[PDB]
């Protein structure tokens, strides 16, 4: 990069230079702002930056740094101890009168954010330990606030200088907690606490309850640590991580373990561990093109990153799993599994064509062996859903793989909570349909034989019942009924399969039932052999569910058109129009059966369709292209952050003589009636213009200088297939990338 | 892979028995490479179907030292039945990858006809039978192609005929396909005057910065069938770091005997050296890595470490490798692994005292080269043995104390 460095600008008091350098780092960690309020993620992140700056030759030795974690403590409104805090850092240099103080927390109104009187005295006490001849009259305190909170906004503030006692606050966060514990009343206000008297012993204890710690450079310089990781040789990357780099990170963490672990309960080890590692990487963000992919969702603790100068095409991805309770050798197994399937989970494989990765299990809490390292090859993301559905009938563990296939391809931007239950259900059912309805391959039996599959979808009589029912009939082989229903969609009955032409005498009927429970996990019951076909049809004559079985039309022509679309005809509008004419032709017979009820349903169906077809090689749903930043004796710098996301992104695989990935982007909207159609096309076309303002996000994903973008509106109330999917009629679809 | 894949791998490895434990350990790694290739064909085999493979790998005729005989193996794997046990494998895929050209077309014709018979006669009433049969052949070949790009290599899609390949044409194609058995097959079809040249071409083409584990068995076969290894070095030296790439990939797959042969030819028979200080250090640390991953082969890994480390051509590299600077030393990813190998308790080793002797000598060498840095060397080694986890390391045991005990032993 071309910045001055985050810590360098901050210490110099260059608030504008720090702002531009920080938004450049945010471009490098696109998920950073999702977790700025999770525990002490942000304070530990900034502490790690300050604690490794000297070793990185960012700060000089005479630029002494002092810090403390000002933990928020008990919440006066529920009595529970919080796990958040304010980080307070001061920099002092002998000979310079200005002492810059920084208060870092997610919110500018966070409790006790300002430096307190006792914090000033504890800091001066620490400064005097190295400078015994200190004259406090010659010290000029410059106090700052650095905050970022959720849209998302980040604020850098130069506080106004206050006179007399108002120069510093009455209490820090931990002081208020100390006194609330001392008085055994967590609901006491600051004004009430001020009224209470303290004996000489209590005031002495309160004064030493706050104390600063000097950050001291170690015996190892880390200037060239990112050079070790900017490599295309997995053995070199593994050796550098196993030795210098991960030894330094864990040992530096150990040097401040007492300040990190003490005076806080319910500490979020997960988010603090990731924040600590990110602060180390951020000290190089101004000199290297580092891509950091963070998955800190519930039940996930992954960080995958790639280190390069800028143009390198085959540098080694590094995949880390941060454990807090399990030993790091188990975390290494999780990191190896995450790295093997990196094409599913991460955007990192878009920035490198390396087939080798380095995986790391790391747990900062362990004193012995806090990390383990290995290498593993990168596998292709090509899961055959219908084939595995037939295989899971007689084989263990395949149900878990089927479940993982559906869940792992959900968009990361949709949280898996009860508030978004219908969003998750629309995505799973739509993706499962697109995969199964557009897979052109026959069934491969275990014995040396192959059979074509006729696919059906069942339209339940109750249009409110949330259940995707599909039937897969392989010729001369068994029949599989697939159910994916909501938690309140349980039924008692059988699907009538009389419409099927069963010629074999050994044809069985199987049932694979999936349920998305209230906790948004996908339970797949054991497959049930419902007996012989004619035996199954004899029974259940009085137990057949109400509804209709619709046959899925042939979709072989979509794969051929997709081949021409992603390759030679990716900039030809007529070729894209023909592709969606054929998708409309395949969907119109069953449109009201599959029920395209939401934008998520429409997007997920196309996601499964494009995934199953050989072309495109890669398709990403709700792909974040980047973000936009808007700027809005006290100096307040406030920046609003707006994300640009692509509903669908299609990409080729880079070849040796064809580095252009032909990036194709689709903006998808759904119109329920004619009145919404014009307003959905307008919103989709306006979203296109917002994407055309982003250039730096598209540059690393292709070697060319063009990106194709098309607005697509699903017309739910269309009466013929020709108007089901609305494509622009008749320029404006080739976004010229300005690399200048 | 999948959990089931690890189970079938262990089952097939348990069948390997041999008096020489070095031979048995090498054959188990060959089974691992075979499984990693053909896991898609055996992933769901129960013990009744797995017995066919048990008897195949129990046949000594299927082996040549620690490597599988692809000529004998490809024969047995294409048999319909061996001694009252039916072959459970999809035999078209076996005959394709093993280049059993006498059976590829008949086996495919069987699958083509039974698959063609499952379509209704009135399914596609716009196509002719010529177009119908070609569509069925393309659908079938595209279906088998999911298991690998090499499985449509032998069937012409226009005629359904067995494809014909020139010896040179097929050799270059199988190298690009990273197809071990096809490379060896087309090698034996080459004219004698071209054998050495084509093998060298495959080596320099695969010894590249982003080689993968699958490339190692091909590199091993090519090196083993090259007569003039001195000429091979000269051709490899025409490409930057070509010598490092070849040895590095071979080391990761535990082809120790092949690496030792290359080290003896190129380093033991001016000031120009065939690889750099970094290549030197990465050889030793990668050997130390696989030493811990494969305890049954730790003797061979240790010998290779000492051959490279103590080679007189790299005496300057050896001294630099024990130079403690910036609170680190390159040998820590070698000395530490050796201490862990010497101390591991999950194995029954006969020569632990020789292992301790090498460790003490390595420490004494580091102390002799830089006496004024030895205190930092000890500090660095203890820290590395406490922070960096390794395979074979006893969990919860302070290995820094083991380093302290060794340093105290040398006064």
Residue numbers in the entry:
A (entry chain A): 2 to 151, 161 to 642, 649 to 746, 750 to 759
B (entry chain B): 4 to 272, 280 to 421
The authors write:
Cytoplasmic incompatibility (CI) results when Wolbachia bacteria-infected male insects mate with uninfected females, leading to embryonic lethality. CI is caused by linked pairs of Wolbachia genes called CI factors (CifA and CifB). Protein-binding experiments and expression of cif genes in yeast have shown that CifA binds its cognate CifB specifically and rescues CifB-induced yeast growth defects. CidBwMel consists of a region, which is predicted to contain two PD-(D/E)XK (pseudo) nuclease domains (residue 1-751; hereafter CidBwMelND1-ND2, ND: nuclease domain) and a C-terminal deubiquitylase (DUB) domain.
CidAwMel(ST), a rationally designed chimeric construct containing the scaffold of CidAwMel and the interfacial residues of CidAwPip, binds CidBwPip(Pel) and rescues CidBwPip(Pel)-induced growth defects in yeast. Interestingly, CidAwMel(ST) could bind a closely related CidBwPipND1-ND2 from Wolbachia strain wPip(Pel) (hereafter CidBwPip(Pel)ND1-ND2) to an extent similar to the binding of the cognate CidAwPip(Pel) (lane 2 vs. lane 4). We next determined the crystal structure of the CidAwMel(ST)-CidBwPip(Pel)ND1-ND2 complex. The structure of the complex was very similar to that of CidAwPip(Tunis)-CidBwPip(Tunis)ND1-ND2 (RMSD: 0.8 Å over 691 Cα atoms). This structure revealed the interacting residues at the CidAwMel(ST)-CidBwPip(Pel)ND1-ND2 interface (electron density for representative residues shown in Supplementary Fig. 7) and explained why certain CidAwMel(ST) variants show reduced binding to CidBwPip(Pel)ND1-ND2. For example, at region 4, residues R114 and K121 of CidAwMel(ST) interact electrostatically with residues E460 and D459 of CidBwPip(Pel)ND1-ND2, respectively. Similarly, at region 7, residues R288 and D299 of CidAwMel(ST) have charge complementarity with D246 and R252 of CidBwPip(Pel)ND1-ND2, respectively. Finally, at region 9, residue R393 of CidAwMel(ST) interacts with residues E257 and D261 of CidBwPip(Pel)ND1-ND2 through salt bridges. In CidAwMel(ST-9), residue 393 is glutamic acid, which cannot bind to E257 and D261 of CidBwPip(Pel)ND1-ND2 due to electrostatic repulsion. The crystal structure clearly explains the reduced binding of CidAwMel(ST-4), CidAwMel(ST-7) and CidAwMel(ST-9) to CidBwPip(Pel)ND1-ND2, which closely parallels their loss of function in yeast growth rescue assays.
